[PDB]
Design an enzyme around this catalytic site. Structure first.
Site, mmCIF file in Angstrom:
data_model
loop_
_atom_site.group_PDB
_atom_site.id
_atom_site.type_symbol
_atom_site.label_atom_id
_atom_site.label_comp_id
_atom_site.label_asym_id
_atom_site.label_seq_id
_atom_site.Cartn_x
_atom_site.Cartn_y
_atom_site.Cartn_z
ATOM 1 N N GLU A 90 0.838 -1.193 0.000
ATOM 2 C CA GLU A 90 0.000 0.000 0.000
ATOM 3 C C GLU A 90 0.879 1.250 0.000
ATOM 4 O OE1 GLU A 90 -0.533 -0.925 4.718
ATOM 5 O OE2 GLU A 90 -2.332 -0.574 3.509
ATOM 6 N N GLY B 168 0.071 -9.318 6.211
ATOM 7 C CA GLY B 168 0.209 -10.005 4.942
ATOM 8 C C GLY B 168 1.495 -9.703 4.205
ATOM 9 N N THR B 169 1.810 -8.418 4.030
ATOM 10 C CA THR B 169 3.039 -8.042 3.342
ATOM 11 C C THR B 169 4.256 -8.526 4.114
ATOM 12 O OG1 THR B 169 3.360 -5.889 4.399
ATOM 13 C CG2 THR B 169 1.851 -5.998 2.515
ATOM 14 N N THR C 155 -4.985 -7.683 16.907
ATOM 15 C CA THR C 155 -5.783 -6.807 16.066
ATOM 16 C C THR C 155 -6.276 -7.458 14.784
ATOM 17 O OG1 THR C 155 -5.848 -4.630 15.003
ATOM 18 C CG2 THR C 155 -3.821 -5.906 14.800
ATOM 19 N N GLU D 246 30.429 -12.041 16.179
ATOM 20 C CA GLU D 246 30.463 -12.692 17.484
ATOM 21 C C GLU D 246 29.068 -13.072 17.949
ATOM 22 O OE1 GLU D 246 31.841 -9.590 17.291
ATOM 23 O OE2 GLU D 246 33.977 -10.059 17.075
#
Ligand SMILES: Nc1nc2c(ncn2[C@@H]2O[C@H](COP(=O)(O)OP(=O)(O)OP(=O)(O)O)[C@@H](O)[C@H]2O)c(=O)[nH]1
Ligand SMILES: Nc1nc2c(ncn2[C@@H]2O[C@H](COP(=O)(O)OP(=O)(O)OP(=O)(O)O)[C@@H](O)[C@H]2O)c(=O)[nH]1
Ligand SMILES: Nc1nc2c(ncn2[C@@H]2O[C@H](COP(=O)(O)OP(=O)(O)O)[C@@H](O)[C@H]2O)c(=O)[nH]1
Ligand SMILES: Nc1nc2c(ncn2[C@@H]2O[C@H](COP(=O)(O)OP(=O)(O)O)[C@@H](O)[C@H]2O)c(=O)[nH]1
Ligand SMILES: [Mg+2]
Ligand SMILES: [Mg+2]
Lengths: 104, 426, 102, 428, 426, 427
Positions: free
Chosen positions: D62, D135-136, D170, D245
C-alpha cells in the site's frame, strides 16, 4: 439547509508527534506543571491551574506546601491558612514548609 | 491508486447516494460547484478515489445513477450538490418497472443494461487500479432490486477479481410499503448469495428506533435516515482516503470478516450518537465509544445480536487514539460476553485506527459484525414468501412475463440452506 | 485528550527540573562531584577524584617515600605560597626567570 | 564496516521511521541530509559533497504510509527512489503477498539492494524489519529473505520480527500468517530477534506508567534497542563485538536462533533523578521478566546463552562482579552443558535522547539478548490457536482462491511441531 | 478510586436525593451548572466518588432517578441543581403504581426493571474500583418500596461482593400517610433482611419531634427533613471523601456494627442541632457533641433506645479534634451507663475522625446505633399486619395480581423470628 | 552498615511520617531531600546532592498514602516506593491476609528485594505496625511470613502498637490481635510493645497537655526509635548495634516482647524547672508512670534491662546509677539472671523538632526491658477475646472471607501456651 461550515484541523499522528515532537511535548507538559499527582487527572483542575498561572513569597509557601491552593481563583483566606479546611498533615508540616520557603 | 466507483439504484438508492455524495464533498472540502475550497493538505491526498478532475479545478463524482422514472432524477438534480454529477452518467429509461422484479430484470433491463454497462466500463477503465464497486439499493422495490441485481451479475461476469460492496436496505413486516416485498427480496438475495461479494444490511425499523431512543428526535425523515447511512458509508471507506496508525482496506476487511464464502451479509452501526440535550452530559473516551458500539440498541438492523452468536466483528476508529486502549477494550468486551462469541475462533474482533475523525467531532467509530442473528430476519421473510406462494398469490405478473415456478423453488432452497448453515455454525 | 503519549503526573513526568535542561541523571563511576571527606574511612569501595594511576604508583615519584601524596603536586597554589616554597628550597633563581616561569 | 536495512510492512517501516530519526540525532545530521561540521559510515554513505543518504529501503504494497513519509520533512533524507510503493495491499493474505503481488515488486527490490551492496564495501550483513502477523511483512518478507539467501547465502541476516501477542491482537488470520512466516524464518534468517506489543505495553505501564501509549513510544524503544546493538560497530569501546560474534556465540545449534531482548534503564526524568544508577542494579533489572520485549516466563525455562551490551560510563570490573552475582543467584538457572553462558560488551558512548521523547539522558544503559525455552512455549501457544481455527478449515478458501493449497499448511504445522520437539530435546 | 452509585426510588426518595445532591454539590464546590468554583483542592481530590467528568469540567452526579410518575421528575428539574443530572439517567415509566406493592413488584417491574438494570450496569461498569450502591426510598409506598426492593434483589444477584446502603423511611401509627403501610412494609423488610447489606431506618415523627423541640422551627416543611437526612448521608460518606486521623469506610463500619448476619438495621442521628436563638450562647466541645449525641430523644426513629440495650454504636466525627478527648468520652459514656450496653462485648463503641467538617460548622458528628430497640417498632408493625390480615381486608387488590396467601404467611413468620432473636439477644 | 524500614497500615505510616521528619532534621537533610557517612544507615545518596530514604510505605486505602505523596515531602519519597492499594481491608484480618493479600505482597517483596540488593551491609529490617486493624495485622503477618522464608538469618524488629485494656476504638481488635500474635510470636526476632493509653497518660502527666492527638504520640515514638538507632548511626563511648539486642535481651527463643520507656519526657518550662542528670533520669526511667505500655512492672520480675544514654554522659555515673537501681529493693530481678543490664552510651544529644513539645536536654535515657507484665497483658487480652468468641460474634465475616474455626482455636491455645510459658519461666 446544509450546516454553515466546519474547518478541517485534525492532523495525522505522524505529522503530530514524531515530526513536531518538541512543540507537542512542550505544550503537553506545559498544560499541567503545578498540579499534584492525585489532582492532575481532572480537566477542570487543569484549566483552573492554567488560569491561576495566567508575590514571590506567597509563591514560595505555595510551592513548599504543594497541595494547599493549586486550583484557587464566603470564606476569606487568612495570612497562613484557610478557615474551613486544615488537614493534620498540613498542621504538622507548616513549620517545615515555612522554613523551606524562607530558604527559597 | 485504489479506486471505488458508485452505482445508485432505485429511488431509495438514489436518495441515499445523493446524501452520501453531499457528505463526502463536505469532508473533502469541495463546494457544490465542483471546485475545491479545502484548507488542509490532507484533503487533496486521496480525492482520486471518488472524483475525477475534468478541467480547471472541476471535480466530478465517480457515480452512475440508474432508475426508470424522471421524478427521482429531478429530485436529485433540484437539491444541493445535484449539479456536480455527470449528465452522461445520468443514464436513464422511461417506462417504469412498477415494483415488478420480472419487469426490472427482463423487460427494461434488456434495453438499458447495455447502456449502463457501456458507461460503467468507460468509467472503470478510465482509471488505473480498481479496488471495488459500490452499489446502493433496496431489496423490496422493483427498479433497484431486479435491474440492480442483474447489473451486479454482469459486473461480476466482466470483472471477477475486484471488491464489491452492496449497500442493501431490506424490508420488514412491521414496515411494509409494498405487498410483493418478500417476493422481490427472495429473488434479489438468491442472486446476491452467488454474485455479491458482501452486502451491508440495513432497514428502516431500526433507524426509526435509533432516532426515537438515542437521537430523541420527533420527526425522523427520510433525509435523516439517509444521512445516517451516508455517515456509515463514509466511516467504512475512511481508511482508503486518510492515513492511520493501523490501516485496513476493503479486501483485508473482507478476508478478516468472511470465514466461509456464503456468509457475507454484515450488520453495521455507527458511534457516537447523542441527543442535543445529552451531548453536554457525555464523555468522549474509547470505553465510551465501545459501550455504545457493542450496545444492541445502537444497531441498524431488526435482529437481536444477543439472540445468537458473533462469528466475527470489526471496529473502525477515527481520531487520535490509544491503540493499547483499543486492544484491551476489545479484549475485555470479548472476555466478558464470552458466550455470545463463537468458541472455535480466538480473537473475534478486528480493530483498526485512523487519524482523521469526521469534521467537527473528536472521535468516531463504525461497527461491522458478521453474526448468526440475521437468520431470524431471513426466516422472517421466508415464512411470508412461503405463505403467499402456497397458493400462487400475485404470481401471474411474473409468470406471464417469462418467470417460472422453478426460479422461486431455487430461491426458497437457497434461503433454506443458508439459514441451515447459520444454524449449523451457531 | 492531554494524556495521549505522556504520563503528565508530577511523580513520573519526563520534564527535567528548570535548573538543568540537560544533565546525565545517574551516578558517575568516578564520583568527582562530591565533597571530599574530612577523614577517609578504613573501607571505601568507591574512589573520589584524582587517584594516581596504577603505572604511576608502580613507578613512583621520589617524594612519595618522604610522604608527599601525588595530589599535592597537581593541587593549585598561589603566587606568594609558591614564591615562599621556592625561597625556602634551594632554587636560587632570580625574579625575572621567576616571573617568566610563573 | 557497513550494514543495510530493509523495512517490509506498516510495522517495519514505522519502526524504521523511529530508527532513522534516532540515528540522525546520534550522528548529528540535520534532516536535510548534511553534517554541519567516519562513524556514520555504517549507515550513511556520503554522496558528492555535503550529503548523507541512509543505507535503507522502505518497501511496501500500500502507498499510504510510504507517501506519508515522502510528504513528511524527511524528504531530503531519503530521495524518492528507494521508497518502493506498490498499488494494492496484500490485505493480510500470505498467499496474496507471496504469490500474487510479490512477484512484481521483488525483482525491483533485488535490483535496488544489489546496487546498494555494490556501492557498499565491507558489508557485514543485512537487517530486516517486519511483523509476521500481517500479509506483506509475512509473504513478501519471506520471499525477499529466500531470494536474498539464494543470492548471498554467507552473509548474516538479522531479522527483527514482531510476533502477535497471546491475548492482545488486532487481526484474525495472523496465526496463519505467523506459521507461514516461521516456515521460512526458521531456515533462512540467521539471527531472529523477537518482539511483541503487549509486553512493551506493560513495560510502558510499569516503568514509564504511560497509561495510554501509542505505537510511537514502542517504535522509539525498539529503535533504542537497535542503536544499542549497533553502537559497537559505530563507536569504539573497551570490549567491542561486531555482528559475527553474535552469530558465533549466541547460537549453539544451526536451528535454535530465537533471542529474547531487554533494555534498561527505561526510566523518566525525576525517577532517574531519584534512583542511584550503577552497574549492579541495571544488570539485575535486565533479568527479571518484568523488563523483557516479549511476554514470556523465563522462570519456566533454563538459559542457554546470554549477551549484555553496555553503553556509557562502564568499566569491566563492576560488570564482571555483576555477572558473578547473577551466576551465584539461584532463581535463574542456566543449562548444564554451558559452563560459561555469559558474554559481555562495553562501549564508551552513552545513549542519546530524542527531543520530545519519553526517556531521560542517562550515564549508562544495558541491552540484553538471550536464549531460553520460553520462546518454545510461545511457539506452542501460537500453534494451538492455529490448530483450533484450522480444524474447521476457516478462512482457507481465500488462500485457495489466491492459488495456494493445503499441503504447505500441513508442512508448516509439522515443521512447528518438529521445532517444539527440538526445543524440548535441547532443554534436557 | 472507591465508587458509590446513587439510586432514588419513588417520590420521597427522589426529593431526598435532590436535596442530597444539592448539599453534596455545595460541599464539593460545584455550581448548579456543573462547573467547579470551590475554595480548596481537597474538594477536587475525591469528587470521583460521586461524579463523572463529561465535557470541559462538566461534572455530573452518578445517580439514577427512578419512579412511575412524571410529577416528581418535573419537580426535580424545576428545582435548583436539577439541571446537573444526565437526562439519559431519568429512567421512568408512565402508568404509576398507586401504593400497590404488587403493582410495583410484579406488573410495572416487568417493564421498568430491565431498563433500570441496563442503566445501572452502564453506570457501574463506567467506574474502575466499585465500592457500593446507595438506595433512598420508603417502606409504605408502592413504586418506592416494591419496585426499589426488586431492584435491590436483582442488584444483589448481579454483584454479590459489593457494598450496599439502604436509606429507608418507615411509617408509624400516629402518622399513617397510607392505609396499606403494614402490608407494604412487612414485604419490604422481608426482602431486605436477606437482600440489603444494611438498612438505616428513618421516620417522619422523629424528625417532627426534633424540629419542634431542639430546632424550634415553626413550619418544618419536607425540605428541612430532607436536609437533615442529606446531612446524615454526607456525614456517613465523608470518610471516603476527606482525610482524617482514623478513617472508616462503609465496609469497616459494617463489620464493626454487625455482629450477626441478620442484624443489619440501624438508627441514626446527627449533631449538633441547635435552635437559632441558642446557637450564639452555646459552647463547642467534644463533650458538647457527645451530650447531644447520646440524647435518646435525638434519635431519628420512633424506637426510644433506652427501652433496650445497645449492641454496637459508631460515631463519625468531623472537625479538628482530640483523639484522647474522643475516646475518653466514649469510655465515660460506656462505663457510667453500664446497663444500656451488651455485656458480652467490651468497648461497644467504634469511633472515626475526619478533618473536614460540613460547610459552616466547626465540629459535627453522625451517630449510628445497632441496638435492640427496633424490635419494638417491628412488633408494632407486625401487630397491625396481623390485625388487618385477619379478615383479609384489602388483600384482594394484592391477590388479584399474582400474590397468594403463603407469601404473607412467610412475611409474618420472618417478622416473628427476627423480633424473637432481638428478644433473645436482648 | 544499614537497616531498612517498612511501614504497614495507617498508623504505621504516620509513625513513619514522624520518624523520617525527625531523621531529616537530625541529619540536616532538607524536605526537598538534599544537603546544603552517618546518613548512610538510612539514606542512600543518589545523583549529585540528593539522599533517598531506605523505607517502604505500604497500605491499602490510598487516602493516607497519597496524603503523604502530595504533602510537603513530595521530593523525599519518590513514588516508586509508596505502594498503595485500591480498597481497605476494613479491619478484617481475613480480608487483609487472604483476599487482598496475594496481590500486593508480591509487589512489596519485588521492591524490598532490590532495596536489599542496593544496600551492602544490611543489619536488618524494622517494621512499624498496629495489630488492632486489619491491614496492619493480616498483610503485615503475611509480609513477616514471606520475609522470614526469603531471608531467615536477618534480624527483624517489629514495633507493634497493641490495644489498650479500656481505652479502645475498634470492636474486633481482640480477634485481630490474637491472629497477629499467632505469627508474630514465631517470626519477628525483636517485638517492641507500644500502647496508646499509656502514652496518653505520659503526655498528660509530663507535658501536661490536656488535648493530645496522634501527632505527639508519633513524635515520641520517633524519638524512641532514633534513640535506639543512634548507637549504630553515630560513634559513642560504648556503642551497641542490632545484634547484642538479640544476644542479651532474648533469654529464650519464644520470649521476645520488650517494654520501652524514655526520659526526660519534659517541656521547655519544666526543663527550665528541673535539673536533669543521669541519676534522676535513670530513676525516672523505671517507675510505671513512664512506661509506654499500661502495665505494672512491680507485679513482675525484670529478666533483663537495656539502657541507652544519649548526650553528655560518662561511664562512672551511669555505673553508679545502675548500682543504686540494683540495690533498691522495690524492683526485684530474677535469680537465674544475676547480671541483667546492658548499657550503651552515645555522644550526640537528642535533637528537637520545630513545633514539638519536648525541650532540648543535655542527656536522655531510653530503657527497654523484659518482664512478666507483658504476660499478664496477654492474659487480660485473652479473657476479653474468649468473651466475644463464646457467642461466635463477628466470626461470620471471617468465615465468609475464607477463614474458619480451627485456627481461631489454634491462636487461643497458642496464647494459653504462651502465658503458661511466662508463668513457668518467671519462677
Ligand atoms: N510495534 C508495532 N507494531 C505494529 C505497528 N503497526 C502495526 N503493528 C503490528 O503489525 C501487525 C500486522 O501487520 P501490519 O503492521 O498491520 O501491516 P502488514 O504486516 O504489512 O499487513 P498489511 O497491513 O495487510 O499489509 C499487527 O498485528 C500489529 O501488531 C506499530 O506501529 N508498532
Ligand atoms: N500510635 C498511633 N496509633 C494509631 C494511629 N492511628 C491509628 N492508630 C491505631 O491503629 C489502630 C487501628 O488500625 P488503623 O488505624 O485502622 O490502620 P490498619 O491497622 O491498617 O487498619 P485498617 O483500617 O483496616 O486499614 C487503632 O486501634 C489505633 O490505636 C496513630 O496515628 N498513632
Ligand atoms: N432510507 C430510505 N429508504 C427509502 C427511501 N425511499 C424509499 N425507501 C425504501 O425503499 C423501499 C421500496 O423501494 P422502492 O421505492 O419501491 O424502489 P423502486 O423500485 O426504485 O421504486 C421501501 O421499503 C422504503 O422503505 C429513502 O429516502 N430513504
Ligand atoms: N422525608 C420525606 N418523606 C416523604 C416526602 N414525601 C413523602 N414522604 C414519605 O413517603 C411516605 C409515602 O411514600 P409514597 O410517596 O407513597 O411512596 P411512592 O410509592 O413512591 O409514591 C409517607 O409516609 C411520607 O412520610 C418528603 O419530601 N420527605
Ligand atoms: Mg500493511
Ligand atoms: Mg486503616
Amino acid at each position: 439547509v446544509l450546516p454553515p461550515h466546519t474547518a478541517f484541523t485534525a492532523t495525522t499522528t505522524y505529522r503530530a508527534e514524531t515530526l513536531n515532537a518538541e512543540p507537542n511535548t512542550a505544550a503537553i507538559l506545559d498544560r499541567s506543571q503545578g498540579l499534584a499527582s492525585t489532582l492532575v487527572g481532572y480537566e477542570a483542575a487543569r484549566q483552573a491551574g492554567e488560569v491561576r498561572r495566567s508575590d514571590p513569597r506567597a509563591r514560595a509557601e505555595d510551592t513548599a506546601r504543594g497541595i494547599g491552593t493549586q486550583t484557587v481563583l464566603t470564606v476569606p483566606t487568612k495570612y497562613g491558612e484557610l478557615p474551613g479546611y486544615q488537614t493534620t498533615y498540613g498542621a504538622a508540616t507548616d513549620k517545615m514548609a515555612r522554613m523551606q520557603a524562607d530558604n527559597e | 491508486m485504489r479506486e471505488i466507483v458508485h452505482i445508485q439504484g432505485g429511488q431509495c438508492g438514489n436518495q441515499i447516494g445523493a446524501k452520501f455524495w453531499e457528505v463526502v464533498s463536505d469532508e473533502h472540502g469541495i463546494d457544490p460547484t465542483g471546485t475545491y475550497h479545502g484548507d488542509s493538505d490532507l484533503q487533496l491526498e486521496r480525492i482520486n478515489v471518488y472524483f475525477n478532475e475534468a478541467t480547471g479545478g472541476r471535480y466530478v463524482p465517480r457515480a452512475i445513477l440508474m432508475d426508470l422514472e424522471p421524478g427521482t432524477m429531478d429530485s436529485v438534480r433540484s437539491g444541493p450538490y445535484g449539479q456536480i454529477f455527470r449528465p452522461d452518467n445520468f443514464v436513464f429509461g422511461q417506462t417504469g418497472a412498477g415494483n415488478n422484479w420480472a419487469k426490472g430484470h427482463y423487460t427494461e433491463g434488456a434495453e438499458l443494461i447495455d447502456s449502463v454497462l457501456d458507461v460503467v466500463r468507460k468509467e472503470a477503465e478510465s482509471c488505473d487500479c480498481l479496488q471495488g464497486f459500490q452499489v446502493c439499493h433496496s431489496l423490496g422495490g422493483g427498479t433497484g432490486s431486479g435491474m440492480g441485481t442483474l447489473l451486479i451479475s454482469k459486473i461480476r461476469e466482466e470483472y471477477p477479481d475486484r471488491m464489491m460492496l452492496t449497500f442493501s436496505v431490506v424490508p420488514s413486516p412491521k414496515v411494509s410499503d409494498t405487498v410483493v416485498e418478500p417476493y422481490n427480496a427472495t429473488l434479489s438475495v438468491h442472486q446476491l448469495v452467488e454474485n455479491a461479494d458482501e452486502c451491508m444490511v440495513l432497514d428502516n425499523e431500526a433507524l426509526y428506533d435509533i432516532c426515537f431512543r438515542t437521537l430523541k428526535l420527533t420527526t425522523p425523515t427520510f433525509g435523516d435516515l439517509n444521512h445516517l447511512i451516508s455517515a456509515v458509508m463514509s466511516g467504512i471507506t475512511c481508511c482508503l482516503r486518510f492515513p492511520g496508525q493501523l490501516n485496513a482496506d476493503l479486501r483485508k476487511l473482507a478476508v478478516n470478516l468472511i470465514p466461509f464464502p456464503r456468509l457475507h451479509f454484515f450488520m453495521v452501526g455507527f458511534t457516537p450518537l447523542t441527543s442535543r440535550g445529552s451531548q453536554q452530559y457525555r464523555a468522549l473516551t474509547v470505553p465510551e465509544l465501545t459501550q455504545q458500539m457493542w450496545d444492541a440498541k445502537n444497531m441498524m438492523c431488526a435482529a437481536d445480536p444477543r439472540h445468537g452468536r458473533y462469528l466475527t466483528a470489526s471496529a473502525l476508529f477515527r481520531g487520535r487514539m490509544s491503540t493499547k486502549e483499543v486492544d484491551e477494550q476489545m479484549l475485555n468486551v470479548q472476555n466478558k460476553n464470552s458466550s455470545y462469541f463463537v468458541e472455535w475462533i480466538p480473537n473475534n474482533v478486528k480493530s483498526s485506527v485512523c487519524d482523521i475523525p469526521p469534521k467537527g467531532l473528536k472521535m468516531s467509530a463504525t461497527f461491522i459484525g458478521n453474526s448468526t442473528a440475521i437468520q431470524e430476519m431471513f426466516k422472517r421473510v421466508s415464512e411470508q414468501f412461503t405463505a403467499m406462494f402456497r397458493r400462487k398469490a400475485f404470481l401471474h405478473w411474473y409468470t406471464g412475463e417469462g418467470m417460472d415456478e422453478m426460479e422461486f423453488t431455487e430461491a426458497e432452497s437457497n434461503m433454506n440452506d443458508l439459514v441451515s448453515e447459520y444454524q449449523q455454525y451457531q | 485528550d492531554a494524556d495521549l503519549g505522556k504520563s503528565l503526573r508530577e511523580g513520573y513526568r519526563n520534564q527535567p527540573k528548570p535548573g538543568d535542561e540537560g544533565r546525565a541523571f545517574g551516578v558517575p563511576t568516578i564520583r568527582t562531584d562530591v565533597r571530599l571527606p574530612r577523614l577517609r574511612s578504613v573501607a571505601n569501595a568507591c574512589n573520589y577524584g584524582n587517584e594516581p594511576d596504577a603505572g604511576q604508583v608502580l613507578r613512583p615519584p621520589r617524594a612519595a617515600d618522604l610522604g608527599i601524596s601525588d595530589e599535592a603536586f597537581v593541587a593549585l597554589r598561589p603566587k606568594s605560597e609558591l614564591r615562599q616554597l621556592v625561597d625556602e628550597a634551594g632554587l636560587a633563581l632570580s625574579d625575572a626567570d621567576f616571573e617568566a616561569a610563573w | 564496516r557497513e550494514v543495510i536495512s530493509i523495512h517490509i510492512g506498516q510495522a517495519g517501516i514505522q519502526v524504521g521511521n523511529a530508527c532513522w530519526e534516532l540515528y540522525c540525532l546520534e550522528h548529528g545530521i540535520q534532516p536535510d541530509g548534511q553534517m554541519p561540521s567516519d562513524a556514520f559510515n555504517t549507515f550513511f554513505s556520503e554522496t558528492g559533497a555535503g550529503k548523507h543518504v541512509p543505507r535503507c529501503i522502505f518497501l511496501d504494497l500500500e502507498p499510504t504510509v510510504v507517501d506519508e513519509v515522502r510528504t513528511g520533512t524527511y524528504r531530503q533524507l531519503f530521495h524518492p527512489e528507494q521508497l518502493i510503493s506498490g498499488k494494492e495491499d496484500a490485505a493480510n493474505n500470505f498467499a496474496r503477498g507471496h504469490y500474487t503481488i510479490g512477484k512484481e515488486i521483488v525483482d525491483l527490490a533485488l535490483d535496488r539492494i544489489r546496487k546498494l551492496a555494490d556501492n557498499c564495501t565491507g558489508l557485514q550483513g543485512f537487517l530486516v524489519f517486519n511483523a509476521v502477523g500481517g500479509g506483506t511483512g509475512s509473504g513478501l518478507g519471506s520471499l525477499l529473505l529466500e531470494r536474498l539467501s539464494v543470492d548471498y547465502g554467507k552473509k548474516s541476516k538479522l531479522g527483527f520480527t514482531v510476533y502477535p501477542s497471546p491475548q492482545v491482537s488486532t487481526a484474525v488470520v495472523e496465526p496463519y500468517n505467523s506459521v507461514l512466516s516461521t516456515h521460512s524464518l526458521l531456515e533462512h534468517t540467521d539471527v531472529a530477534v523477537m518482539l511483541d506489543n503487549e509486553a512493551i505495553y506493560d513495560i510502558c505501564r510499569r516503568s514509564l506508567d504511560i497509561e495510554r501509549p501509542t505505537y510511537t513510544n514502542l517504535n522509539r524503544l525498539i529503535a533504542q534497542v537497535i542503536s544499542s546493538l549497533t553502537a559497537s560497530l559505530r563507536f569504539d569501546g573497551a570490549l567491542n563485538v561486531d555482528i559475527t560474534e553474535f552469530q558465533t556465540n549466541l547460537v549453539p545449534y544451526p536451528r535454535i536462533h530465537f533471542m529474547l531482548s531487554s533494555y534498561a534503564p527505561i526510566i523518566s526524568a525525576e525517577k532517574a533523578y531519584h534512583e542511584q544508577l550503577s552497574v549492579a542494579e541495571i544488570t539485575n533489572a535486565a533479568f527479571e521478566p518484568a523488563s523483557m520485549m516479549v511476554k514470556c516466563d523465563p522462570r519456566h525455562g533454563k538459559y542457554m546463552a546470554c549477551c549484555l551490551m553496555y553503553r556509557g560510563d562502564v568499566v569491566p570490573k563492576d560488570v564482571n562482579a555483576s555477572v558473578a552475582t547473577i551466576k551465584t543467584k539461584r532463581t535463574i538457572q542456566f543449562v548444564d552443558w554451558c559452563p560459561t553462558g555469559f558474554k559481555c560488551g562495553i562501549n564508551y558512548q552513552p545513549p542519546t535522547v530524542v527531543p520530545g521523547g519519553d526517556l531521560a539522558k542517562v550515564q549508562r544503559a544495558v541491552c540484553m539478548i538471550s536464549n531460553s525455552t520460553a520462546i518454545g512455549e510461545i511457539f506452542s501457544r501460537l500453534d494451538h490457536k492455529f490448530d483450533l481455527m484450522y480444524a474447521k478449515r476457516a478462512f482457507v478458501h481465500w488462500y485457495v482462491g489466491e492459488g495456494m493449497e493445503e499441503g504447505e499448511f500441513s508442512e508448516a504445522r509439522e515443521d512447528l511441531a518438529a521445532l517444539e520437539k527440538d526445543f524440548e530435546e535441547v532443554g534436557a
